[PDB]
Every structure is written in C-alpha cells, then in structure tokens.
Design a protein around this ligand. Structure first.
Ligand SMILES: *[C@@H]1O[C@H](CO)[C@@H](O)[C@H](O)[C@H]1NC(C)=O
Lengths: 93, 257
C-alpha cells in the first residue's frame, strides 16, 4: 500500500563491546515523506546520521539512517518508522 | 566498462515536510554530492569528491541546478499546481558505455502521469505514460535555448570524465564479503528458515545462490540487497528448508574478489 519495507540490521556480526554500525533502511514507500528514528533501549539514539532521500531507477524512494554504536550485553536496538501518520517499530530481528 | 553520471532530483512544491528540490547525483554506485533548497550550496558525499575535485566543478555544478530549476521547474510549476501534482522525480544522466556510443537522457516521473523520456542527443521527448502538454512543453524548452542543452549533454560527459578520474580509486575498491549462514527462528511464513548473509562487498556485481545436492533450490528463495554505510553492499538469501537436513544445503557465492 505504498507502505515502507524496513530492515534493521548491523554492519558486522554483533560482538559485544566491539564497535559496529546500526542500520535502518526503508525503501519502496509511496508518499516520500518519512521519518526514521534509531532506538536504543526504547530511547532515541542521538547524533545518528541519515542518508538523503532519493530513489532507484524504478522511481522507488529510499532512506537510510545509521549510527556507530557498541553492542553491549543487555542492550536492545530498534527503529521507529513514522510514515504517513503511523509509527512502526522494527527491532533488530 | 560503462559509466553513468546520474543526478536524481525530487521536486515537491508547497510540500510541508519536504523542501522544494533535492538533487543527489551519483558516479555509478557512488553518491557524489547532494543539494536541496534549504542548504543554499551543494555538498559532496565522498571525501574524494571533496579533495580530488577542482573547485571550478562546484561553481558550475552550482549554476547547473539553477538551469534545471529555472528552465524547467519554474515553467511547469503553473501546470503541476493545476493538475494537483504533488511531486516530480527527475533523473538526468549521461553514460559512456565501453566508449562505443554515448547516451545522455533526462526523465521526469510526474507523479500520477507517466515518465517523460527526453533523449538529449535527438533532442525529442516521448511520453512513457499519460500524454499531456508536458511531454512537448519540455521538448520545446530543450529545442529553444540550445545553450542549456549544452549543460545537460556535453558538459555532462566531461564532468563524467573529471569525476570518473577523481573516483577511479573508489569505484575500483574491492571490499570482500563474509558469507555467514544462520538458521533463523521459526517465523510465521517459513517453518525452518535458512539465511545466507553476505556483507561488506563493494563491486555490486555478485552471483550467489543456495544449492541442495548441487541442484539450485529456488522454491522459497527470498533475496534482499541492502546498502551498507560505507558504500558497500549487503545481501541476504532466505529459504524454508521445510525439515530437510540443513547439512545438504550450501550457499555458493562468486564475488570478483
Ligand atoms: C557525532 O559523530 C561525529 C562523527 O564524525 C563525532 O565526531 C561527534 O563528536 C559526534 N557528536 C556530535 C556531532 O554532537
């Protein structure tokens, strides 16, 4: 329904206490206005960097917000996608 | 090989969340720069764009956006308001394929109507979707003022060679993937998922598949390719093993390496 496909993933395998990158990527979403919020432990992660809104040759739009974090035992990470009025929350998964 | 210089615009006038114009632009894979209406100057998106690239590129790139803005977006903005057009996607690209022949196009995906494929060697615009005064309106923008089409065809390929030379290092890097195979928790849609995870590989060209007894399993093949953060790529391949011995399954992966 123009609804984002969102994946939340880590650059390299989680190794606790070893630096990594936390990645939330949404594509294929019809109204191009979209919000992407990286969540550590239910909280919004600051200083996160976003790519620019753009698209593929097939005109489908794309956004990617990411941040360097260090995975720690106990810690949990997710993504709030606010698209078209709705927020949805994807966990690493 | 072939090499394309793309600039990917987004036009969204009076959009409350988005600005009027975004720009992007990517030497192949590599996003090389970015402009939008708030920023008031282009910004580069690779270090080597910021270093191995003349300043005189950026003052003239800077002028180039105005041209598309002034010779196109302004002239049709009256029209789009009338058609209740919410936004337009504009791809402007030139390509130099094994130096055989050269194509520079310009496409516009008017939202709701189709795309206007304007060929800038023949200087003629075709409708790829709904026909309307726009297809020819921009033909006639491009037929008159031939100086402007001198920024979108010929400077496009010289700028390609410039940036192609600045970026030759980058576009040639070879990040090597790590092929990892996980059994994924039994989800709602497959009963026993098997993921093959291939992450950090820079040449996007890649050939991977799952095999069972050599035979290529294609039944429950789910295939994703996601961007990384450092211009490399990520690939996931899922299959429902459906309670077959997983030792019999193998993920063959050919990357340039
Ligand atoms: C944000 O990330 C940058 C990475 O370049 C870091 O050096 C900086 O200290 C961080 N904090 C900010 C910008 O508040």
């Amino acid at each position: 329904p123009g609804s984002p496909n969102v994946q939340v993933y880590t650059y390299k395998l989680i190794k606790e206490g070893e630096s990594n990158v936390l990645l939330c990527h949404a594509k294929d979403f019809s109204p191009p206005n979209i919000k992407l919020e990286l969540l550590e432990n239910g909280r919004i992660i600051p200083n996160t960097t976003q790519s620019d809104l753009s698209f593929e040759s097939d005109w489908s739009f794309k956004l990617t917000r990411y941040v360097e974090f260090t995975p720690q035992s106990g810690y949990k990470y997710s993504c709030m996608v606010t698209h078209n009025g709705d927020s949805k929350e994807i966990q690493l998964d | 090989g072939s090499h394309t210089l793309q600039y990917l615009f987004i036009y969204a006038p009076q959009h409350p969340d988005l600005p009027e114009l975004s720009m992007s632009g990517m030497l192949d894979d590599l996003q090389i720069e970015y402009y939008d209406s708030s920023l008031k100057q282009i910004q580069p998106r690779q270090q080597w764009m910021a270093s191995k690239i003349t300043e005189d590129y950026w003052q003239e790139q800077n002028m180039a956006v105005d041209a598309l803005q002034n010779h196109i977006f302004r002239k049709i903005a009256p029209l789009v308001t009338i058609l209740g057009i919410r936004y337009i996607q504009v791809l402007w690209k030139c390509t130099v394929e094994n130096s055989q022949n050269t194509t520079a196009f310009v496409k516009l995906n008017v939202h709701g109507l189709g795309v206007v494929d304007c060929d800038l060697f023949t200087v003629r615009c075709r409708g790829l979707g709904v026909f309307s005064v726009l297809i020819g309106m921009i033909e006639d923008i491009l037929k008159n003022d031939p100086t402007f089409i001198q920024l979108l065809n010929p400077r496009c390929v010289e700028n390609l060679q410039t940036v192609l030379r600045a970026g030759k290092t980058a576009l040639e890097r070879k990040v090597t993937p790590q092929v990892l195979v996980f059994e994924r928790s039994s989800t709602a849609e497959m009963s026993t998922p098997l993921l093959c995870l291939i992450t950090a590989f820079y040449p996007r060209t890649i050939n991977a598949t799952w095999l069972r007894k050599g035979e290529p399993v294609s039944e429950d093949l789910t295939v994703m390719v996601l961007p990384n953060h450092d211009a490399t790529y990520r690939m996931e391949i899922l299959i429902d093993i459906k309670n077959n011995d997983p030792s019999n399954y193998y993920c063959q992966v050919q990357h340039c390496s």
